[PDB]
Amino acid sequence: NLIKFDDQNKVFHLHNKQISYLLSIEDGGTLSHLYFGGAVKNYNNQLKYPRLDRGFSGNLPESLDRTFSRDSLPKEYSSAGEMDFHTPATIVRNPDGSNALFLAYKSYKIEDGKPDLKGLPHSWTKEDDEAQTLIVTLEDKVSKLEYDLLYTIYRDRPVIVRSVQVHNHGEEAVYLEKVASMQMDYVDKDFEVITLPGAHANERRVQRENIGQGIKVFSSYRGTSSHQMNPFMALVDHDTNEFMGEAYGFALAYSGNHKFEVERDQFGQIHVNTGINDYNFKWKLNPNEEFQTPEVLMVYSDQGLNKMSQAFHSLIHERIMRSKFKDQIRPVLVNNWEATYFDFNEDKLKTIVDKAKKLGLEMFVLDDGWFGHRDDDNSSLGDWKVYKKKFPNGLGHFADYVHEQGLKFGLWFEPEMISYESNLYKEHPDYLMHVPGRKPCPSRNQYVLELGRKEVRDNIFEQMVKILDSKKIDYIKWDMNRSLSDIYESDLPADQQGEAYHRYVLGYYDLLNKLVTRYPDILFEGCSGGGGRFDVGQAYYTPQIWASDNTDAIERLKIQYGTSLVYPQSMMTSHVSVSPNEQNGRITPFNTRGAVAMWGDLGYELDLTKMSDEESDQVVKQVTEYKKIREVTQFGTLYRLKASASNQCAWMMVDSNKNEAVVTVVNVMAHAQPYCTKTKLAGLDPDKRYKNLETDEVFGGDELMHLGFYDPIERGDFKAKMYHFKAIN
Amino acid sequence: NLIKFDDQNKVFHLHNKQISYLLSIEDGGTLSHLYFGGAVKNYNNQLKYPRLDRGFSGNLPESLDRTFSRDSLPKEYSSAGEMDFHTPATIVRNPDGSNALFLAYKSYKIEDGKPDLKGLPHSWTKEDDEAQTLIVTLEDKVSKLEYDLLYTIYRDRPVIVRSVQVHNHGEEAVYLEKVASMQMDYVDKDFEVITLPGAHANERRVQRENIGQGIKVFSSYRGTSSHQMNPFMALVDHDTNEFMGEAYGFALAYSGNHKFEVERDQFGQIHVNTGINDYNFKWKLNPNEEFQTPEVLMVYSDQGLNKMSQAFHSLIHERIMRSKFKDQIRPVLVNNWEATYFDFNEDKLKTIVDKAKKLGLEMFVLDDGWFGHRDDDNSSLGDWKVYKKKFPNGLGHFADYVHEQGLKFGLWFEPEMISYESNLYKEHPDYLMHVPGRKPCPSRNQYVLELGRKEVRDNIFEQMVKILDSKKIDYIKWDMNRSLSDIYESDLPADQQGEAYHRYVLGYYDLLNKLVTRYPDILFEGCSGGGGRFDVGQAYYTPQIWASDNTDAIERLKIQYGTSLVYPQSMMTSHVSVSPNEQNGRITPFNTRGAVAMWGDLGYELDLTKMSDEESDQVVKQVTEYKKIREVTQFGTLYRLKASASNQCAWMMVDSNKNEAVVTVVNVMAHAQPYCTKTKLAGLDPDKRYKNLETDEVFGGDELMHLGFYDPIERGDFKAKMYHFKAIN
Amino acid sequence: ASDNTDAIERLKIQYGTSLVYPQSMMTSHVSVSPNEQNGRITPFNTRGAVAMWGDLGYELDLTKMSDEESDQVVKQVTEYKKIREVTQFGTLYRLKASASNQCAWMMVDSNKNEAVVTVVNVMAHAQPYCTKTKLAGLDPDKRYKNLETDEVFGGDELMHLGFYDPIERGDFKAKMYHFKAIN
Amino acid sequence: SMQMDYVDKDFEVITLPGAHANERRVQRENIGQGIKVFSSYRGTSSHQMNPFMALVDHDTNEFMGEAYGFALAYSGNHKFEVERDQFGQIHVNTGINDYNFKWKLNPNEEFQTPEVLMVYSDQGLNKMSQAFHSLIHERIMRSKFKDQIRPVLVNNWEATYFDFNEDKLKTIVDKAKKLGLEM
């Protein structure tokens, strides 16, 4: 069906209408990568790697053929100790102290659908016939280890999904010092690389570079996927842009330490690994045990980055996210954090609720400060019980009030964290993650829990169900405000402390899965001081994620633009916040804040009771208009049109039948002598006729995409305009 | 004089007329990097790092101050487990299984001269007073480790030399999983990075790149400094070129596995480590032991890359090389490898000696094939006794014949290597480096010796002195023709197998040092399939090195150009070889091979007896000319003028008093309609008057550097011209 | 120099004008905000600092200024009279071009005893990169007192080390420095 | 007014294009084969293209590298031509634009062109600019005021446009006086 093995020339071919993926069994049972790209009907050996004696690239054991080398062949995988000098995909530590591993082809099987990954988020299928998986097994006969390489192709997607499962069939333990989820080697490709670096309050700007000889590394070891480097990269041709050219995307489905490596070697070849970062990673694999890596989603586009991005959005939204809310319009909420910070009580919050109701908002979210005795960020983490001074009648009483006003109710937690000045720390001080005999380093004056221990998770779990069993909470904002610095797990032997990072993430997933599974009618929004854990693995549990603590309309342009490179727009949230902006002091028009916050799932995060009449009227109009378009903005096909470095940022959504489109154009710097700009649309049907619903003028889809229209000329920095088109009969 | 500590502001200042280097003791005893660059007389706290609370950049143990972080401060050093998220300079494994180290300032001392590095090559002083060394001690009071950071400054050079010595003052062992020789952090610099990648027969092309957010790694783990990536890196301004702009050069004095890391972080700062590669590196440091790293040479130029390169040339030549030959003109020799390969006997070689004498050559080097039963490269490594079939009366009989013809005699060895097909292997099979139980991988159908074992080194040492004590050998070419792939040392415990790479190099150095020390009157030429081990460390033992097995005049332009970026031209050798070229098939003029080969130390490597009469005449003239100019070409100050991607490559040497200059200009591709080009000189005295010794015309130095001269126009590819100027009274 | 009197677009106009023409040849006025030609909003102090690069003037209805703006004018005028000999006639060095997100320049009197430096930041950032400003045109062996802080630095320090620019929130912000050689 | 031909130079060209309310941004380009023309025929030297050009090495910046500056001393139509030819040589003309220029020169008459100032810097654009500043200020400008501090003036144009009378201007004058303005 989708996957065939030609036993004549030892070539595996994964194939659908859009893509072909070819790999083969070369000399020494070496698994060789041939091709990933546009579909071909057949293969006829034209990509067999040329034989050449290359100085200092050595050969297979006992071989006299100097023209074949594992140091030059493009491959599907690699290891330390096989006469390869590229950065290896896997590294094993053997009882004799060596790091040797020499993998050779053993067998394969082809099966329908794709197997569940134990303890990890993963992509899946609705019907078994919609995908197939190839599992190629390699073995080292001396250490008796077997590596299963998994490859999944979906029938209807330009996607290959890969991961690795290691098995110890020997009599002694080994340690896994590194296990990449995949490796891909290219020949005669002159790619550029695109990644999404950033910082707190500055996530995921698009960065794009040449690849020189050596290794470029994009990674995190913060215990999280991180603000500073998203687990994603794309390889593109020099000329690829948003609308044309080839692109290969690689998204790692994992929310902890990642490592993407892009190496160009001495023969001009590009070698790529992705998976769990090997930094302090050393997994003890006992006899008869197995280790499963997270998976990587790989997308090929033959036609620009929007098309690449759209394939990620569709896969994530349709075959990764489990939430019952994933296909449901998301509520327009007010969140009180920037509005009040810690300085509030119930009565203060009730006036905000009352104002939210008059403005037509749909949900009120209670943010940090409701619990323990949290008056500031120096205490109380670990004590998930209401702070009575602020809620004298309990939380249920406030929740009832919110519901009474026609609003849903949301609540913030930070389940992974603990403060010295908490009841939790006084009763269970060993729950705090640290190295015994060493003072731990603080970050935001708090510390991290040992989520690798069941007892620790059970305690936090029980605290939480005590609040959530009332079913008065409709939504949970799950936050996480520091990286891991003191890496240890107190109940493991010394020789297993290389497991602490990954066991932390497994425990996080386990606790999280337990809560979203127990409360399927709760909308969970992920958060980590903004977008510090914004990845495909997280999507599996939370259908939306706070993109950034930076709520400036202008800096949000670059953050939402970069985020959309991988993640569907319904997965990121965006709030209208006060001006001057609280993080950078920028002054922006209220209407621009609105229009930028409608790209993600719209909400409000400012003190609504302090808005002028004029601002309130604008909120009324924004919310009324958003309710009419949000099915299209939240779930339509997304096209990036213009990137902010150009002084304009523009994007649009089109519904799946191309009958309706919503376009936004934002101008950054004003100029006294402005150049005329045009905006051209994308993704319309050239033979439909579209009415501009503001002006009632009608335009062929062909006109909107080829002619476009003039952006209106106006004075003032930071101005936006929106357009709404609908196909007529 | 050169080093001061201000104990009130806690600032160390190393200073001479050219450079200043500033570092301070910051909060928490954190050693902070302030500045390295043009000299300043005083310092007044203006570079104190700004305090800002940065999200997810955590703080010191027990500190309430969030505006200071080891994750944002620029530093002299760093480690895993100190709340820093950059790639760490050092990583330690403790008995409790953790990788935590927390270093804090302990004390300093300032000494004259600089201390010897045990078991390693290093720079040194002739008079104590020409340099001073600052040693800053940092400690971790829990593990009781102490790290000594050494900083040496020479009075008359724009150089800082750095290394690290780790001491275990606790009661239990630790393991060192990484120990960088140096770290340097920069603020608000938008550098490009230059490196010297290549391949076998394609070494050290200049590569130049932008630095994006993430980590760029330039490294080797071939057990040698390598063909693929030289242990060198420079950081430069975007507008820096050969003649102007700032440049920072870093050369690691080490001939094993290296790793240069250049990270640009989330706050736009650039973070650099250099040292021994941490790949499979794990050094067990028992109580009361120490570990010394190789040193790094750092050069600052405020005026282009020529001036940076010249500071390295001068340091290497005057204060690193130890050979009695280092200041002596190098012989014009013939080497028979490309002339005959393996297919020769004594009588064939004698005709070549005879022709060499007629042509005025000064030395004959007997290359591979003279020993064991070496008829091809499938046997005999490890059997260093003459091959009686080829030398029926012994090696001394041939050596004597060479001397009778008035030439010196050189001999090739590959002391680090072993063939299965050898007496060495038959008698001592366990000398062969391999993981017990695993067939080793072959490369050039040979294997590596366990140089980490005294027994093994002594065996080879004794074989070699038996030949060399005859006093009949004036020169040794020391070759090494494959990388290390099966990494183990049979006499170490399993938990010390992470010492195998570094013990191998230490053993190599130990054997090499012993031999060069016993034979001060022998000229040693290093080699490793060409330039696979061309580094500052090797220079300490061998004053010249075979630059590449590529002997094509045109590809050698790029190899020699990139080589000269760090290494004095007297350290590289270059031979006129046959056309068509044996490696790439290019056809070049005999004159062009001559001119390109006089940049390095000139030699011939082709069957002299087969040359036409016209070529013999060219050789006679080349050799007669070279003897006149070679004091200037071999030891004069070097200036690169034009790089070959321009279609021209040009360079010149000027003697120390600027009275004599030799210039070479090579045109690569001809054109039917050629543009006129000019060549301008550099490094002359503008107020001297220089006679062109071919034409007798006289030009002011100012004219030669400002006006230059037209290059002659000719047809034909791959043509060269040389000029020789001398100052007149 | 231009009918455009926006402090921010004036950075590029004044920068390109100075490529050829002495600064005393161009005039620059403090004008109202929002700017009348492009609608940009800028701090009053930034308009002052950019308008002192050329020969300073005011072009706005002085009778409509708030008391706070009038005090700023009094202070701008008082400061400008002290320094204008150097800013109008000192040797001009451009230091930073606005596309870098900063525009900076400085004037040094003919004996290198006095210098006036201006640094203007265009876009604010939530997560700002530290920047330094290095001076040019000073005597490396003179010692120069910052007249605001009273701290003293060698000419060599000010040109090779420079100093950290202060980190502030808000778009379109300026800082000036006045150095004078001491005995 | 002049012509300059270069051999084996791989210059970039800097010019000062703009528009009304947007004059003299720095622009910097490669020179390909063909002719690049920078000019005015507005009867003035113009907002759109200042009569100035510099040729610089690729690595030249504000502080280092060679630069050649060419300023045409003329306030009418100019034309700067930078031609790179079929043999890689660079040919430059500067003078009065020839566009609808046709001057009848009778027997025994003469025609004098405006002059071009050419500056060579061996050390960056600041140094080039400083030489233009010094020449223009000391050897071109004739005005008695050229060496005198320039007055801090208020100009009423953006303050009132056309809508004023004397009484209104007098209130602005009074306020200007309180603020310490001089004209």
Side-chain angles (χ1 to χ4, degrees), chain A residues 1 8 110 224 233 310 398 482 553 654:
Chain A
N1 205 27
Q8 214 56 205
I110 291 174
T224 63
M233 122 208 157
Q310 297 162 5
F398 178 64
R482 58 154 294 166
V654 183

PDB file of all heavy atoms in Angstrom, chain A residues 1 8 110 224 233 310 398 482 553 654:
ATOM      1  N   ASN A   1       0.818  -1.202   0.000  1.00  0.00           N
ATOM      2  CA  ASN A   1       0.000   0.000   0.000  1.00  0.00           C
ATOM      3  C   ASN A   1       0.876   1.286   0.000  1.00  0.00           C
ATOM      4  O   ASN A   1       1.369   1.678  -1.054  1.00  0.00           O
ATOM      5  CB  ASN A   1      -0.950  -0.043   1.190  1.00  0.00           C
ATOM      6  CG  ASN A   1      -2.188   0.783   0.972  1.00  0.00           C
ATOM      7  OD1 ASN A   1      -2.615   0.994  -0.166  1.00  0.00           O
ATOM      8  ND2 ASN A   1      -2.780   1.259   2.063  1.00  0.00           N
ATOM      9  N   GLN A   8      15.051  -7.107  -4.400  1.00  0.00           N
ATOM     10  CA  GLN A   8      16.119  -7.147  -5.402  1.00  0.00           C
ATOM     11  C   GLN A   8      17.269  -6.196  -5.031  1.00  0.00           C
ATOM     12  O   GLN A   8      18.400  -6.627  -4.795  1.00  0.00           O
ATOM     13  CB  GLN A   8      15.572  -6.763  -6.783  1.00  0.00           C
ATOM     14  CG  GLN A   8      16.229  -7.496  -7.908  1.00  0.00           C
ATOM     15  CD  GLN A   8      16.123  -8.998  -7.742  1.00  0.00           C
ATOM     16  OE1 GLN A   8      16.955  -9.740  -8.263  1.00  0.00           O
ATOM     17  NE2 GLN A   8      15.103  -9.456  -7.005  1.00  0.00           N
ATOM     18  N   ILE A 110       6.197  -4.107   8.471  1.00  0.00           N
ATOM     19  CA  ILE A 110       5.304  -3.075   7.977  1.00  0.00           C
ATOM     20  C   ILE A 110       3.939  -3.297   8.586  1.00  0.00           C
ATOM     21  O   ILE A 110       3.419  -4.392   8.525  1.00  0.00           O
ATOM     22  CB  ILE A 110       5.160  -3.132   6.449  1.00  0.00           C
ATOM     23  CG1 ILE A 110       6.454  -2.713   5.763  1.00  0.00           C
ATOM     24  CG2 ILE A 110       4.036  -2.219   5.984  1.00  0.00           C
ATOM     25  CD1 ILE A 110       6.392  -2.912   4.227  1.00  0.00           C
ATOM     26  N   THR A 224      12.999  22.300  29.923  1.00  0.00           N
ATOM     27  CA  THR A 224      11.826  22.661  29.173  1.00  0.00           C
ATOM     28  C   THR A 224      12.243  22.857  27.727  1.00  0.00           C
ATOM     29  O   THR A 224      13.407  22.982  27.404  1.00  0.00           O
ATOM     30  CB  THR A 224      11.271  23.998  29.667  1.00  0.00           C
ATOM     31  OG1 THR A 224      12.249  25.023  29.428  1.00  0.00           O
ATOM     32  CG2 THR A 224      10.994  23.920  31.147  1.00  0.00           C
ATOM     33  N   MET A 233      13.269  23.153  13.410  1.00  0.00           N
ATOM     34  CA  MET A 233      14.110  23.778  12.383  1.00  0.00           C
ATOM     35  C   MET A 233      13.623  23.449  10.981  1.00  0.00           C
ATOM     36  O   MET A 233      13.028  22.405  10.760  1.00  0.00           O
ATOM     37  CB  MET A 233      15.565  23.343  12.537  1.00  0.00           C
ATOM     38  CG  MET A 233      16.149  22.668  11.333  1.00  0.00           C
ATOM     39  SD  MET A 233      17.410  21.561  11.908  1.00  0.00           S
ATOM     40  CE  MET A 233      17.488  20.402  10.556  1.00  0.00           C
ATOM     41  N   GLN A 310       1.167  25.062   6.920  1.00  0.00           N
ATOM     42  CA  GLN A 310      -0.199  24.529   6.862  1.00  0.00           C
ATOM     43  C   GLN A 310      -0.225  23.005   7.103  1.00  0.00           C
ATOM     44  O   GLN A 310      -1.126  22.499   7.790  1.00  0.00           O
ATOM     45  CB  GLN A 310      -0.889  24.906   5.514  1.00  0.00           C
ATOM     46  CG  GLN A 310      -1.044  26.466   5.364  1.00  0.00           C
ATOM     47  CD  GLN A 310      -1.302  26.950   3.932  1.00  0.00           C
ATOM     48  OE1 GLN A 310      -1.470  26.151   3.000  1.00  0.00           O
ATOM     49  NE2 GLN A 310      -1.376  28.275   3.761  1.00  0.00           N
ATOM     50  N   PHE A 398     -16.931  32.896  44.807  1.00  0.00           N
ATOM     51  CA  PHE A 398     -16.527  33.792  43.712  1.00  0.00           C
ATOM     52  C   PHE A 398     -16.872  33.166  42.387  1.00  0.00           C
ATOM     53  O   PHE A 398     -17.434  33.845  41.511  1.00  0.00           O
ATOM     54  CB  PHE A 398     -15.028  34.171  43.758  1.00  0.00           C
ATOM     55  CG  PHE A 398     -14.600  35.055  42.613  1.00  0.00           C
ATOM     56  CD1 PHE A 398     -15.134  36.336  42.464  1.00  0.00           C
ATOM     57  CD2 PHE A 398     -13.690  34.607  41.668  1.00  0.00           C
ATOM     58  CE1 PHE A 398     -14.761  37.165  41.383  1.00  0.00           C
ATOM     59  CE2 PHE A 398     -13.301  35.429  40.607  1.00  0.00           C
ATOM     60  CZ  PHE A 398     -13.850  36.710  40.461  1.00  0.00           C
ATOM     61  N   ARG A 482      10.118  28.963  35.896  1.00  0.00           N
ATOM     62  CA  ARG A 482      11.600  28.958  35.986  1.00  0.00           C
ATOM     63  C   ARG A 482      12.143  27.703  35.311  1.00  0.00           C
ATOM     64  O   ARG A 482      11.416  26.709  35.131  1.00  0.00           O
ATOM     65  CB  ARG A 482      12.124  29.069  37.452  1.00  0.00           C
ATOM     66  CG  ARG A 482      11.598  27.913  38.406  1.00  0.00           C
ATOM     67  CD  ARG A 482      12.557  27.661  39.562  1.00  0.00           C
ATOM     68  NE  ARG A 482      13.841  27.121  39.069  1.00  0.00           N
ATOM     69  CZ  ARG A 482      14.982  27.039  39.774  1.00  0.00           C
ATOM     70  NH1 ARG A 482      15.051  27.477  41.039  1.00  0.00           N
ATOM     71  NH2 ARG A 482      16.068  26.510  39.201  1.00  0.00           N
ATOM     72  N   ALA A 553       1.452  45.020  21.021  1.00  0.00           N
ATOM     73  CA  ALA A 553       0.992  44.718  19.656  1.00  0.00           C
ATOM     74  C   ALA A 553       2.139  44.635  18.658  1.00  0.00           C
ATOM     75  O   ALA A 553       2.130  43.780  17.776  1.00  0.00           O
ATOM     76  CB  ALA A 553       0.016  45.739  19.192  1.00  0.00           C
ATOM     77  N   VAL A 654      -8.415  31.643   5.577  1.00  0.00           N
ATOM     78  CA  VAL A 654      -9.449  31.265   4.595  1.00  0.00           C
ATOM     79  C   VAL A 654     -10.148  29.999   5.067  1.00  0.00           C
ATOM     80  O   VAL A 654      -9.471  29.037   5.498  1.00  0.00           O
ATOM     81  CB  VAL A 654      -8.821  30.986   3.212  1.00  0.00           C
ATOM     82  CG1 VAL A 654      -9.889  30.667   2.143  1.00  0.00           C
ATOM     83  CG2 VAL A 654      -7.957  32.162   2.766  1.00  0.00           C
TER      84      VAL A 654
END
